Design a protein around this ligand. Structure first.
Ligand code: DJM
Ligand code: NI
Lengths: 238, 95, 79
């Protein structure tokens, strides 16, 4: 036969699903493990038969178990079931989203939250800047990026954004389509305000002395909207 | 190349087959140049190359520059256009 | 006119300039090997006529008063 370890693991999964199906035929309400095994085994057999696509199987997996077929709490625990199966065109991943609707009140690991909002970046006053994407490709900017050093095809008054970042929730982002124009909110970077990296326009302590060097560097490298005056005076370390 | 011997950061040296300047020096150096580069007198570019190389004017200037203290070191260039047993002798001949 | 030069006064003394003050000073050539390292990092090499052009260009770019170096300056491989 020349079986691989993958084939042995899938054989075990198939017979777990068969046990779940026999217990369902005897009238027993299925638990969490039994329901997951039953859905996975059904998808693998349908893909072996070769008459259905993966997208059709993603919808067919949602009709296998009624809400009355499982114990109370099972449906809230199963958010998705994934399984890889070999089609005539090879191995594909099939994910079944929310296969069972709930019918009882038991939610394991339930969260009970207060209703007060959370205030982020307290004590930081924001300013508003209009930004336009004049390039031909989309741009997306994260919450803690140094906004002065973003993609040179974005056009905005870059002098007002030195030492600042977006005032949004940490880990979220703002998207600019080609030709799109909108306003954003910016707040001061905290901590020691030592800015290293990002386009290597600063690489030192952020202050008013380092802003002139950064503006001159940004103009020489063609960043849009940068205004630094002519007859610039160099320092000993630039 | 001889103009760099006036500079502050240069330590300038001469090799012994050009000192002292004698009546056989130019012909000997020309025939040495023709052998090593495999030049031919029938080609106008080999003749133009050779006449820009030897230059009896700078060779004549070299002895006087040694007497003025502008050149500071003598050496051999041994078996590669120079004579390893004659550095001291040719120094005193030039003096 | 002051490249490679220092004040011709007694060693360890000094000359003072008040705001708005104008006066004349006496200058003589630096001795020794004339290797100038430090001071504003305008030379950092052997002092000669080749290094004077680089020093004048550097002094004009950093805004030192009274420095006259011509336009269309030609860079070297090590500046
Ligand atoms: C004038 C001359 C004499 C000899 C013996 C050789 C050369 N010759 C040939 C190819 N390249 C060179 S010049 C290198 C040298 O002689 N010392 O460094 C020139
Ligand atoms: Ni040699």
């Amino acid at each position: 036969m020349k079986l691989t370890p993958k084939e042995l693991d899938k054989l075990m999964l198939h017979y777990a699903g068969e046990l779940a199906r026999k217990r369902k035929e005897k009238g027993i309400k299925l638990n969490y493990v039994e329901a997951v095994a039953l859905i996975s085994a059904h998808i693998m057999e349908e893909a072996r038969a070769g008459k259905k696509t993966a997208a059709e199987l993603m919808q067919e997996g949602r009709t296998l178990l009624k809400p009355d077929d499982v114990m109370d709490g099972v449906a809230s625990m199963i958010h998705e079931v994934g399984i890889e199966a070999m089609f005539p065109d090879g191995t594909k991943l099939v994910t079944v989203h929310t296969p069972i609707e709930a019918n009882g009140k038991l939610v394991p690991g339930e969260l009970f939250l207060k209703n007060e909002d959370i205030t982020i970046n307290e004590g930081k006053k924001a300013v508003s800047v209009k930004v336009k994407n004049v390039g031909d490709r989309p741009v997306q900017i994260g919450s803690h990026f140094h906004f002065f050093e973003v993609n040179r095809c974005l056009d905005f008054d870059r002098e007002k954004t030195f030492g600042k970042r977006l005032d949004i929730a940490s880990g979220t982002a703002v998207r600019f389509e080609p030709g799109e124009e909108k306003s954003v909110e910016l707040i001061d970077i905290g901590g020691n305000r030592r800015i290293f990296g990002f386009n290597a326009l600063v690489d030192r302590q952020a202050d008013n002395e380092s802003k002139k060097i950064a503006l001159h560097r940004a103009k020489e490298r063609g960043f849009h909207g940068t205004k630094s005056d002519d007859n610039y005076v160099k320092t000993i370390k630039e | 190349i001889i103009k760099v011997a006036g500079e502050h950061n240069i330590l300038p040296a001469s090799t012994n087959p050009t000192i002292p300047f004698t009546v056989n020096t130019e012909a000997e150096h020309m025939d040495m140049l023709m052998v090593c580069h495999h030049l031919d007198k029938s080609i106008k570019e080999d003749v133009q190359f050779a006449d820009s190389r030897i230059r009896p004017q700078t060779i004549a200037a070299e002895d006087t520059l040694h007497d003025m203290g502008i050149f500071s070191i003598t050496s051999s260039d041994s078996q590669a256009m120079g004579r390893v047993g004659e550095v001291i002798t040719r120094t005193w001949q030039t003096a």
